Amino acid sequence: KIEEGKLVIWINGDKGYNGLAEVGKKFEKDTGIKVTVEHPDKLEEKFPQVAATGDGPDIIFWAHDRFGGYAQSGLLAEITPDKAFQDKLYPFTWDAVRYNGKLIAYPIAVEALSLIYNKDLLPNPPKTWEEIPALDKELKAKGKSALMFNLQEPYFTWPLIAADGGYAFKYKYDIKDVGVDNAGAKAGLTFLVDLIKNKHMNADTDYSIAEAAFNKGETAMTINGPWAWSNIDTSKVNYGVTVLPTFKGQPSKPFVGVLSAGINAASPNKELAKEFLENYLLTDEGLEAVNKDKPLGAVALKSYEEELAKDPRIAATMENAQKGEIMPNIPQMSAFWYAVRTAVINAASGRQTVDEALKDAQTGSELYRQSLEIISRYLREQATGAADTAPMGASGATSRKALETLRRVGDGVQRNHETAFQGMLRKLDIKNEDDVKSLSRVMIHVFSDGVTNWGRIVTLISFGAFVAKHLKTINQESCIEPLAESITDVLVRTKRDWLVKQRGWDGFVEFFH
Template structure:
């Protein structure tokens, strides 16, 4: 395991530093930090950045002295950061462990150890315009019927970023596709990929069927195109996540959220992303960081403060979830999460994103799905067998 360069210049008298991306509830997090300081006398500084992950990785490559003690980011890159020695394993207390849903812990578990404290969980679901859809379809096959009903009005039934593995994966996983086989200790076997599984092929064929019917434009959709059509009332449903709710509400769309429909009679299985607080390996404040997270940040009142600033989506905390239970959108999102599976976090995910993205572009352009997916799987297996080093994303 690589270790940070020597020369950590900060001392135990420095404040605890928390970094978070600018799109999260950083103002709420600042209020939480202030309350902790007032209670304990220990200063906590919250800093937020656009493209915070780039800044975090640059700070870590430089030894970490300019970086945070606590780093808040989704779990999907922890495999690389663990390998580089940038984040520390943690041993959550029993009260914290029992309050947080298991799927969230699964996301932050790798190699038999836990690498972060989950704050929220998210997965894509079916967001629908209530003015256009009375009852969301229970199967993807029903989408074609709904489209025929809406087509005379110049409205498409459904859209999503069709070239993105993240948004298209739930349809592929419905039929049994898997990214990498997971071992019992939570690690993954990069030589065993199932992106070319017959279920994934059927999903690719269904996507091309939607294009042939005009539900999806020929060549596919980008995220911005799907979002614009949804906001403009030209698209009735959208496969997206809780981060899109605020924009739809601002556009005056009365929307509902439902679990993704089935495909071929089997439930769609989205990636579950887990936003969590990680403790930096080289921090001089590791014990202090754990105290702040376990005994203050994860309390329902603290999570409520952050959520009031910017919605967390679905909280990982059971106690916080029950506070939000009256919100039908949160309930539906939790259903989507329980149907999904944690996004793999091993470094080889770089290969998955690269080669499945290329395969989906080809499928969008009309290449037979089986050919495109088998070629992508063969490339991933070849890289794993060769033991190729994995570049940081």
């Protein structure tokens, strides 16, 4: 599928892709290999679907948070730089691109949101979020506004949400512990909704609108990353970059991202990509080429970062980064981001209340792990005859009651559909972990076809248990957990919006009560 003898690269439209293409030209001048740089819309969504079919770019650029999902899906090639190259980058940047013990990408730069303010409108930036309403009122009398930033991406709103105690996954990570719906998160989002209620912000303000307003000098402040600095320079706005405002006396905690370059598992040009990334991009001159297009932030390369660190704007970036947290790269990050995105937009527009919106975001973020906990335990206890003695953990009553519901209803299905299941089992012929990996396509084909209800979900899991008993019987018990993860993946991927609308596994319990 992917063409040999050339390099195709994907990077976001807000990054210095003209600078990157110029690095690609130097690579072409040396090697005779053409390098095509593209910046397609929603590439972070497009990549996992096209790469799965063996297609897509040789190299994909994104923040490290999305890269665990890719690797888990077998979409990323394991990268193996020698010691000499590894020592040229900061170790913690390597940490951000490590997944299950393996390095799955090259770290490029460290990104953190900062407060960007117009020094001509606002000689001193506000230290607190609380004082911004009164500041806006003051600025409105001059035909200006205080603050405008992207409200369509939760990335920009998260620092405020996390300030008073809101969090994604509790940190060792406890993935079952999601704090998107606690008091702190409610406090942060409410303050944002109130800003909109009191005409201090507009719910439909996106990236382009916020950037245009600041760079034209219509609003005193914005919230953005280093990549935005270029266009602000062009606009000749007397701007400064500083620490984010505190909320309730506590610092804003932005999720910190490490711009990373991954190599497609289906790429026939893995050696070319490695050569490009190591010996052309991750150099003083290579990063400078991109940085001069759009600023990268604090780059992973020590030799170049030592120079950039002298920039007050970089100092402000790293200060904000220190008060924030490095994003997790667990596969669930995509689901978390989608849930929180919807929650922020819905609360901002009044479609839901803060309590309602964050409630759904909680259910959406927990959905995979909670589903896995239930499906894994059912499959394993059915196969072995004995239950799991371990505590259910967070949201334990839900998991426990769902499992008990599943036991009652699942056993009925397996009983009544026994002959049908045995016929299906024989046709699939499942005898090792290799065969279990093949099931994903067949499973998705049958399940996603037709209507949606709890009954089909029970059938899905019950046949999974039926297969699990077969796997155990033929001494393939090690294949049960991969099967459980596979089924769980299919379920939450295909019925994500439906499950959330049913209030998750609580809905399942109530439905069969």
